[PDB]
């Protein structure tokens, strides 16, 4: 019996995105009006606009929060070919201050902070088919150093860090490929950090994702011996990735992978545009051209099913 | 709306939903405003105050059970489990009663309150059916006594009818009088039926002779007793002989002048047509089942119950009425299909409470196949993990979910770590509670996260003492150095330390970082200076400068202090100080920028150095004289 | 001995309504504050049905809620100022006086100080961690290290001691009419004279070598120099504030954080303590019977009798209050426990 | 009583506080920990000596 | 002959059960004879 | 003197040994029942017998006899899965036979409904080595009954009524 309560946003232009902070006490919204707004949740469960500023002169494609250990930090990326880092400089005098602009050749299609145990790192991807990884050398001085350039050889549309804090797994990034490519398949690529070469190397290519990829999400690993990846294309796909075996005598490779499609769902009825896991990785949300958000969950027999569908008027489908 | 794409964002237990736009650019005629806030929440009835009370009381019950699961064997243990089951059902009762008073006093929530009373009725109904069966598992004989008690505890309409009849000035002339007599017979309540018949025996002489025969038949009716030495075969023979006595009285036309006494005698024979004519007194097919068992099959075996249950449902529902979801649950229980009982209740119930606690209790009865599901955990751990995860969504109940996760080490420790790091720490009291919970369960990284978060919150609030205390608890040497440097900004500026008493009491915590070490040792030097231990203060300063624990600007500061110290009215010690001065100067020539190199104190430093050289020379001569 | 009432909110604070010293009436009304919910409240409760004149019926009476009011933030601390007025400290840094209207069974906001506690420079609200009342005077302490003095009829703060502590203060009590004691996150008990024009404490007491947070402080009712404190280590410390800077006694009381300590107001040979470990202990110093029994340094003179009053396996007991034969306490188990026959 | 007092005294005289020893390559944190151990030893020795003189009397 | 000793242990256990049966059966026969007398 | 030592421990040693004799496992149960059989025989005071009755262990041992109907049905087979069950049954029947030799024991057994429970057992109606085995079942059951009642007191005449049943 989910209940939705409308608020009068009164946005100058429609906001193309909303992002919660890590604690779900704050949200950021962004719009065609060239602004970002920040909203704080009162004790009475009401939202109040606490900051509003003009951010750019280009289509803000993505917004992301840093981990709260680095303070109140936002990153945004744009059609203007830049990513920007913002810090909430409060006195009640909040005024999200631009700390840097990353300027290294085409639209920056996605931006994601790395898992906190890797430090204050930011990945960007661009339609030039490059992923760039920056590091802030001082968390108190939000200067950024370009650490890595990863040539994907396909237009990058989206990126996901593997959130696994296990020291048994090298840092991993999934990347997509929007290119319609009548033929080229492999539109999801996986990169692994190689300690011996101090470089990201291509570990995997999901050859079954011959369709254009719109979004990708690694599931929270929560002690599994295998990774789970959701992929948004013309359908919703779920992959399990099992790392292969090993010998302590010597090792310098990407440790090849066994990949299985465990689910494929065409029930979207339109090019599924977004996929998002809940905080436990037990429920998937998807959105598509059918004007619905769908909720997916496995039962105790690992059988995934839909568990909810919505309407244009805002009512949940009976 | 106007073919708009849905954006979503997962919160810690909430789903944020919004209209993104169109991925089309400014387009689409259909015009309006996207002022819609959509928080989709999983779960709903948990918010009830009474249900929360139930949950607290039963967490107490669960903890008790777990702790006592090591102490008792066979029969004693079985009885203890039965009593735990009864306690759960009593909590259900209290909750229903409270909800009912609430509905009575409040008209607007009474619709919903009655819906929830019916929900709890569902819960107690299923819990108790399952209990009785698996946990008691009574053999042929006691089974029917318990089923008569079961119908009596859940079907109260006959007692209301009889109370209304008894409130009338003339109970025997009341329209429902014979319905009260027949209802007591249908429930096996022969003594209460006889008390009503004794009133009718007063009305007429012809009624009195028939009432005496019927009273004697009801009095002689064989009943099973929980403790008799009587065998089921000796009971069956007495029951057959009593039934032949009833049949003989009917065949002799003994009751032909009173249709109601004849109908009661036909009920005593188990006449199915007359039992079905009295459906409105039984109200349910399962009351009809138990009345059929009483008058046709009093020695029924557990293994035969399903056949009679199905036959009773089919006969009772023999019109346009479809079985209710409760009927499927009760039939599955009479079939002894525990998995089907759990499945049907999982479909009908909004809440996992019934299926979680009934399955937990039935697992303690050693019934389910004893193996893990599909992830190194069993039906019990899976359902407890999902229920506990549900409690973590709620701002006050997440603390209860912690203890449920402790139940299974494999299936609740990693979830507990993940959730403990996500708790909104708004107050020091809440953080201290979370820390106590983690420390008991050995979770270091989670506690480090807690402490660092608290200390950064303190850096934002400008509470330097609280921030330092939290950084020390974090062992956080990096954050320790950060706060030491903030105090250094403050002292480079004011000429005095804030919070003197804390720095003076650092003790062994001073060793957490070299920067903190320097800070504390320098504060000790100032303390020596206030105590006129001038030599001691100066030597401490010199040692700090030579160890280079001091940051390369405190070199100037400490060097000027050495300046007046030297200025006052062994040779090796004098040479040492000279070496320290020269090292400082070489460092300056290299590290210090040309801009900072050009400052005022140079000439003052040179005069201090000349005074030191003169004192050392004379001091060395004095030392040589002492050696002589 | 205890009636338990489940209330669908965690209870941070419980206090008895003060009885007039001339009244033969037993305490019957108490207040509660809630915490760790989206909507917190102050509630008033009665233990007796207004009308039972039988001296001979076993008290099986569940406490009945008389009235409530929404409280912004988490009720961090709560005290009665008098019979009609309840003071609260909020996690929002607000100090509020509520008035209880007994005739109508309602609470109303009488007065508030919305900027009682805040960090200097950011103007960010800081939690008000403890309060103490001596009608008409109110003192509050907070995470901002401030000591505020109010008078119930004054809209303005009468006195602030800015930067009184560089650490969070957790507890405050009156030593005398113009003197208070505070406890903090670095294990210090600090004595203050509220007439002294400076911001320095008059005296500082601490356990030597250890910086264990102190959460609670209470003063012996008849002996103005005897003080009890509780810490994060579950230790009960007894102090003579005239003798040295160290406690006179260190007693192993709890397995986790000690939230409250109270001397019995009329029989101070009894003391009560509650903890995060879920326990509620009664301490009796009368068992050997003017040397305060609590200040006995002779382990052979004054056997303290110690009794756990609650069942094993309660969640955190966040607050207790004791008046005459009556004790109330509040827990994280969404429960209020009440006894009317302590002894 | 004289034999009991002597045995209490004899137990106490044979349990003197241990003087802290500095290991010859101690870190800065270990030197601060040693000064804290030495101050603790002087205090513990003062208490032990006061108790010894009372038991001796 | 360690295995023989193990077998002997099993044999001794069987002998103990047999002695128990010998005693109780003899007692029952004696009781029946006493009742007849 | 041995009995004084058994008592001296208290109802604690008696409870642990009697509980374990009931529902331990195979060998241990058999040996524990044998031990109980032997201790109750030298029980002139009959304290052990009183403890067994008051603590409910005697009732549990009697109720557990209904367990063997399925065992007997499986056993009437040409090949027997395990003779262990037969030995437990023997030790158990031996112990019960020993308890029945006592004038009081016979009364306590009658109060506990031993004849009623034997009358409910269908194994006695399955007359077929298998024939020898039916024979032996009959032996123990009827044993206990007859011996008991006979050596039973004159006041407990119903004994005759229950046996006739």
Q: Which of E17, E28, E32 to mutate to test the interface with F (most CBs of F within 10 A)?
A: E28
Task: Measure CA C239 to chain center.
Answer: 18
What totals of helices (H) and strands (E) does chain F contain, helices first? 11, 0
Q: Do F146 and E16 touch (CB under 8 A)?
A: no
Structure tokens at F64: 């557990």
Contacting residues of B for F165, CB less than 8 Å apart: 231, 234
Q: Do F116 and B230 touch (CB under 8 A)?
A: yes
CA separation (Å) from A92 to A37, A95, B480?
Answer: 16, 10, 28
Degrees (nearest 5) of the Cα angle C31, C32, C34?
A: 160
C143 vs B59, B436, B461: nearest CB: B461
Q: Whole-angstrom Cα distance, residue C213 to residue B17?
A: 44
What's the maximum distance between 2 C-alpha atoms anywhere in chain D? 51
Count of CB atoms within 10 A of residue B413's CB? 16
* Dihedral angle sign, alpha carbons of residues C199, C200, C202, C206: positive
Angle formed by the axes of helices B142-154 and B107-130, to 10°? 180
Q: What's the reported resolution, in angstroms, to a tenth?
A: 5.6
Interface of E with F in 1-37 (CB under 8 A): 13, 16-17, 20-21, 23-24, 27-28, 31-32, 34-35
Which chains share 3+ C-beta pairs under 8 angstroms with F?
B, E
* Dihedral angle sign, alpha carbons of residues E3, E6, E11, E12: positive
Q: How far apart are the first and last CA of chain B?
A: 105
Experiment type? cryo-EM
Contacting residues of F for E29, CB less than 8 Å apart: none
Q: Which long-range contacts (CB under 8 A, 24 or more apart) does C203-208 make?
A: C203/C241, C203/C245, C204/B501, C204/C245, C205/C239, C205/C241, C205/C245, C205/C246, C205/C247, C206/B505, C206/C245, C206/C246, C207/C237, C207/C246, C207/C247, C207/C250, C208/C246
User: What residue in B sits closest to C332 (Cα-Cα)?
Assistant: B399
Buried b (16+ CB within 10 A) or exposed e, C8-23: bbbbbbbbbbbbeeee
What is the distance in angstroms between the Cα of E1 and the nearest Cα belonging to chain F? 24
Considering only CA atoms, which of A230, A231, A224 is closest in space to residue A169? Answer: A224
CA separation (Å) from A122 to A21, A112, A161, B563?
Answer: 17, 6, 10, 50
C72 vs A43, A90, A92: nearest CB: A43
User: What residue in E sits closest to F102 (Cα-Cα)?
Assistant: E31
Structure tokens at B366: 């050693």
B436 vs C119, C168, C257: nearest CB: C257
C38 vs A45, A90, A92: nearest CB: A45
What is the distance in angstroms between the Cα of C332 and the nearest Cα belonging to chain A? 20
Q: With contact defined as beta carbons under 8 Å apart, do B40 and B14 qualify?
A: yes
* Dihedral angle sign, alpha carbons of residues F5, F9, F13, F15: positive
Burial of E2 (0-12, 13-18, 19+ CB in 10 A): exposed
Question: Is there contact between E and A if contact means ≥3 C-beta pairs under 8 Å?
Answer: no
Q: With contact defined as beta carbons under 8 Å apart, do C46 and C59 qualify?
A: no
Burial of C337 (0-12, 13-18, 19+ CB in 10 A): buried
Helix (H) or strand (E) holding A189: strand A189-194
Beta bridge partners of B124: none
- Phi then psi for residue C45, to 5 deg, are -130, 150
CA separation (Å) from A155 to A126, A212, B371, B553?
Answer: 7, 11, 49, 51
**Secondary structure, 3-state, C160-226:** EECCCCCCCEEEEEEEECCEEEEEECCCEEEEEECCCCCCCCCEEEECCCCCCCEEEEEECCCCCCE
Beta bridge partners of C67: C44
- Phi then psi for residue A151, to 5 deg, are -85, 105
Tell me the DSSP string of B221-242. Answer: -----TT----HHHHHHHHHHH
Considering only CA atoms, which of B153, B142, B158, B151 is closest in space to residue B286? Answer: B151
Helix (H) or strand (E) holding B40: strand B38-40
Q: Which long-range contacts (CB under 8 A, 24 or more apart) does B116-121 make?
A: B116/B45, B116/B48, B116/B51, B119/B45, B119/B349, B119/B350, B119/B351, B120/B92, B120/B95, B120/B96, B121/B96
Beta bridge partners of A134: A122, A146
Beta bridge partners of B285: none
* Interchain CB contacts (distance < 8 Å): E and F: 42
Q: Whole-angstrom Cα distance, residue B408 to residue B385?
A: 9
Structure tokens at A191: 């990169």
Count of CB atoms within 10 A of residue D50's CB? 10
Q: Whole-angstrom Cα distance, residue B487 to residue C62?
A: 55
Check if B12 contacts A (Cβ < 8 Å). yes
What's the alpha-carbon Rg for chain E, to the nearest Å?
A: 16
The DSSP bridge pattern shows strands C159-161 and A121-126 to be unpaired
Helix (H, G, I), strand (E, B) or coil at D52: helix
Q: Whole-angstrom Cα distance, residue C124 to residue C127?
A: 10
Interface of B with A in 316-335 (CB under 8 A): none
Contacting residues of B for F19, CB less than 8 Å apart: 73
C119 vs B430, B461, B499: nearest CB: B461
Count of CB atoms within 10 A of residue B397's CB? 22
Helix (H) or strand (E) holding A216: strand A215-218
Contacting residues of C for B432, CB less than 8 Å apart: 213, 215, 232, 257, 276
């Amino acid at each position: 019996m989910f209940v939705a309560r409308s608020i009068a946003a009164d946005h100058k232009d429609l906001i193309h995105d909303v992002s919660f902070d890590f604690h779900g006490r704050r949200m950021a919204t962004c719009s065609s009006d060239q602004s970002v707004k920040v909203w704080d949740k009162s004790e009475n469960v009401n939202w109040h606009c606490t900051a509003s500023w003009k951010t750019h002169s280009g289509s803000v494609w993505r917004v992301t929060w840093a981990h709260p250990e680095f303070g109140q930090v936002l990153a945004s990326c744009s059609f203007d070919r830049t990513a920007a880092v913002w810090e909430e400089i409060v006195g009640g005098q909040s005024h999200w201050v631009k700390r840097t602009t990353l300027v290294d050749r085409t639209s920056v299609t996605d931006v994601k902070f790395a898992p906190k145990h890797m430090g204050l790192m930011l990945a960007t991807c661009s339609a030039d088919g490059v992923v760039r990884i920056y590091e802030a050398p001082d968390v108190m001085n939000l200067q950024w150093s370009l650490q890595h350039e990863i040539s994907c050889k396909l237009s990058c549309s989206c990126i996901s860090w593997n959130p696994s804090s296990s020291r048994a797994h090298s840092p991993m990034i999934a990347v997509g490929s929007d290119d319609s490519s009548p033929n080229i398949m492999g539109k999801v690529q996986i990169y692994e950090y190689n300690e011996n070469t101090r470089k990201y190397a291509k570990a995997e290519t999901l050859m079954s994702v011959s369709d254009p990829v719109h979004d990708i999400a690694f599931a929270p690993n929560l002690g599994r011996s295998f990774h789970i990846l959701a992929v948004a294309t013309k359908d919703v796909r779920i992959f399990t990735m099992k790392p292969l075996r090993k010998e302590l005598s010597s090792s310098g490779g990407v440790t090849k992978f066994e990949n299985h499609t465990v689910a494929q769902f065409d029930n979207h009825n339109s090019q599924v545009w977004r996929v998002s896991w809940n905080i436990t990785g037990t429920v998937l949300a998807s959105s598509g051209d059918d004007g619905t958000v769908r909720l997916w969950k496995a039962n105790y027999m690992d059988n995934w099913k839909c568990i909810g569908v919505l309407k244009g008027d805002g009512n949940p489908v009976g | 709306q106007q073919n708009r794409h849905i954006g979503f964002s997962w919160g810690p237990g909430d789903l944020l939903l919004y209209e993104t736009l169109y991925q089309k650019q400014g387009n689409s005629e259909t015009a309006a405003r996207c002022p819609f806030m959509y928080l989709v929440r999983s779960d709903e009835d948990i918010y009830s105050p009474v249900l929360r009370k139930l949950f607290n009381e039963s967490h107490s019950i669960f903890v008790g059970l777990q702790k006592s699961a090591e102490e008792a064997s066979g029969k004693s243990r079985k009885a203890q489990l039965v009593q735990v089951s009864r306690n759960y059902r009593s909590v259900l009762r209290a909750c229903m009663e409270e909800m009912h008073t609430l509905s009575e006093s409040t008209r607007e929530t009474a619709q919903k309150y009655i819906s929830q009373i019916s929900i709890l009725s569902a819960m107690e109904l299923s819990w108790n059916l399952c209990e009785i069966l698996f946990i008691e598992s009574a053999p042929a004989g006691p089974l029917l006594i318990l089923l008569l008690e079961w119908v009596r505890l859940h079907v109260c309409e006959v007692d209301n009818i009889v109370q209304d009849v008894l409130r009338s000035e003339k109970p025997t002339e009341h329209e429902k009088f014979w319905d009260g007599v027949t209802g007591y017979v249908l429930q096996g309540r022969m003594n209460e039926a006889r008390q009503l018949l004794a009133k009718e025996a007063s009305t007429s002489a012809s009624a009195r002779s028939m009432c005496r025969v019927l009273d004697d038949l009801l009095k002689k009716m064989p009943m099973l007793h929980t403790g008799g030495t009587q065998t089921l075969t000796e009971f069956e023979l007495k029951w057959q002989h009593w039934r032949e006595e009833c049949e003989r009285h009917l065949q002799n036309g003994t009751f032909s002048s009173n249709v109601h006494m004849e109908a009661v005698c036909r009920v005593l024979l188990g006449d199915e047509e007359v039992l079905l004519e009295k459906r409105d007194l039984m109200t349910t097919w399962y009351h009809f089942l138990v009345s059929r068992l009483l008058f046709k099959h009093p020695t029924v075996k557990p293994t035969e119950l399903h056949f009679y249950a199905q036959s009773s449902l089919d006969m009772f529902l023999a019109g346009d009425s479809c079985p209710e979801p409760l009927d499927n649950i009760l039939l599955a229980a009479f079939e002894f299909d525990i998995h089907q009982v759990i499945k049907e209740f999982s479909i009908v119930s909004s809440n996992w409470w019934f299926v979680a606690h009934l399955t937990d209790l039935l697992d303690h009865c050693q019934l389910f196949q004893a193996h893990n599901l599909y992830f190194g955990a069993n039906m019990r751990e899976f359902l407890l993990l999902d229920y506990a995860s549900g409690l973590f969504s709620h701002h006050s109940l997440w603390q209860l979910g912690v203890d449920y996760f402790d139940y299974c080490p494999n299936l609740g420790r990693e979830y507990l770590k993940l959730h403990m790091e996500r708790i909104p720490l708004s107050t020091e009291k809440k953080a201290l509670k979370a820390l106590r919970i983690c420390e008991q369960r050995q979770m270091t990284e989670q506690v480090r996260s807690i402490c660092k978060t608290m200390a950064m919150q303190s850096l934002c609030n400008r509470r330097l003492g609280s921030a330092l205390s939290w950084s020390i608890r974090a062992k956080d040497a990096a954050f320790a150095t950060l706060i030491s440097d903030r105090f250094l900004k403050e002292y480079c500026e004011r000429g005095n330390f804030t919070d003197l008493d804390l720095i003076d009491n650092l003790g062994s915590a001073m060793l957490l970082s070299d920067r903190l070490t320097f800070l504390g040792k320098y504060r000790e030097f100032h303390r020596m200076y206030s105590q006129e231990q001038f030599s001691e203060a100066a030597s401490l300063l010199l040692s700090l400068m030579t160890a280079r624990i001091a940051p390369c600007s405190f070199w100037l500061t400490l060097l000027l202090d050495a300046l007046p110290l030297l200025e006052q009215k062994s040779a090796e010690q004098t040479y040492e100080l000279m070496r320290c001065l020269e090292d400082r100067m070489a460092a300056k020539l290299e590290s210090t920028s040309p801009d900072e190199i050009q400052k005022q104190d140079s000439s003052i430093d040179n005069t201090k150095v000349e005074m030191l050289r003169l004192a050392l020379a004379r001091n060395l001569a004095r030392a040589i004289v002492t050696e002589g | 001995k205890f009636a338990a009432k489940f209330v669908s909110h965690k209870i941070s604070r419980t206090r008895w309504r003060p009885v007039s010293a001339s009244s033969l009436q037993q305490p019957d009304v108490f207040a509660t504050g809630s915490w760790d919910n989206e909507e917190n409240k102050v509630c008033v409760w009665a233990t007796s049905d207004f009308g039972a004149t039988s001296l001979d019926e076993e008290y099986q009476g569940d406490p009945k809620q008389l009235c409530d009011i929404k409280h912004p933030g988490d009720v961090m601390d709560m005290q009665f100022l008098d019979k009609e007025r309840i003071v609260t400290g909020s996690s929002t840094g607000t100090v509020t006086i509520f008035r209880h209207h007994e005739n109508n069974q309602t609470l109303s906001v009488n007065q508030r100080w919305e900027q009682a506690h805040y960090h200097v420079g950011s103007n960010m609200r800081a939690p008000c961690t403890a309060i103490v009342c001596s009608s008409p005077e109110i003192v509050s302490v907070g995470e901002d290290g401030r000591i505020n003095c109010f008078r119930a009829e004054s809209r303005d703060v009468l006195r602030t001691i800015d930067d009184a502590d560089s650490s969070t203060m957790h507890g405050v009590t009156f030593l005398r009419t113009t003197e208070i004691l505070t406890v903090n996150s670095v294990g210090q008990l600090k004595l203050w004279d509220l007439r002294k024009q400076g911001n320095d404490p008059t005296q500082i007491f601490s356990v030597t070598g250890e910086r264990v947070p102190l959460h609670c402080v209470d003063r012996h009712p008849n002996q103005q120099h005897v003080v009890a404190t509780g810490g994060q280590d579950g230790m009960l410390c007894i102090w003579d504030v005239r003798h040295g800077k160290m406690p006179m006694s260190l007693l192993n009381a709890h397995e986790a954080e000690m939230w409250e300590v109270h001397f019995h107001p009329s029989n101070p040979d009894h003391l009560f303590t509650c903890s995060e470990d879920g326990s509620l202990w009664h301490w009796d110093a009368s068992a050997d019977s003017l040397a305060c029994a609590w200040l006995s340094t002779d382990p052979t003179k004054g056997q303290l009798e110690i009794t756990n009053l609650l069942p094993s396996s309660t969640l955190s007991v966040n607050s207790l209050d004791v008046l005459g034969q009556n004790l109330v306490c509040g827990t994280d188990a969404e429960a209020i426990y009440v006894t009317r026959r302590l002894f | 009583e004289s034999h009991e007092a002597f045995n209490e005294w004899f137990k106490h005289i044979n349990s003197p506080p241990q003087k802290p020893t500095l290991v010859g390559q101690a870190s800065f944190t270990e030197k601060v920990a040693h000064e804290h151990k030495e101050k603790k030893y002087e205090m513990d020795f003062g208490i032990w000596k006061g108790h010894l003189d009372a038991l001796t009397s | 002959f360690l295995k023989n000793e193990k077998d002997n242990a099993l044999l001794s256990a069987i002998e103990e059960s047999r002695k128990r049966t010998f005693v109780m059966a003899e007692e029952y026969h004696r009781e029946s004879m006493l009742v007849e007398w | 003197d041995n009995l004084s030592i058994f008592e001296s421990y208290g109802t604690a040693l008696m409870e642990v040994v009697c509980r374990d004799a009931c529902d331990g496992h195979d060998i241990g149960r058999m040996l524990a029942l044998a031990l109980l059989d032997r201790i109750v025989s030298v029980d002139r005071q009959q304290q052990w017998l009183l403890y067994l009755s008051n603590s409910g262990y005697l009732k549990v041992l009697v109720d557990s006899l209904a367990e063997d109907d399925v065992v007997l049905r499986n056993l009437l087979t040409p090949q027997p899965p395990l003779l262990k069950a037969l030995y437990i049954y023997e030790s158990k029947m031996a112990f019960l036979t020993r308890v029945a030799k006592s004038s009081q024991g016979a009364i306590e057994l009658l109060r506990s409904g031993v004849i009623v429970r034997l009358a409910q057992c269908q194994v006695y109606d399955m007359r077929p080595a298998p024939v020898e085995r039916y024979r032996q079942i009959l032996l123990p059951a009827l044993q206990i009954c007859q011996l008991i009642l006979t050596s039973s007191t004159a006041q407990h005449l119903q004994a005759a009524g229950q046996v006739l049943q």
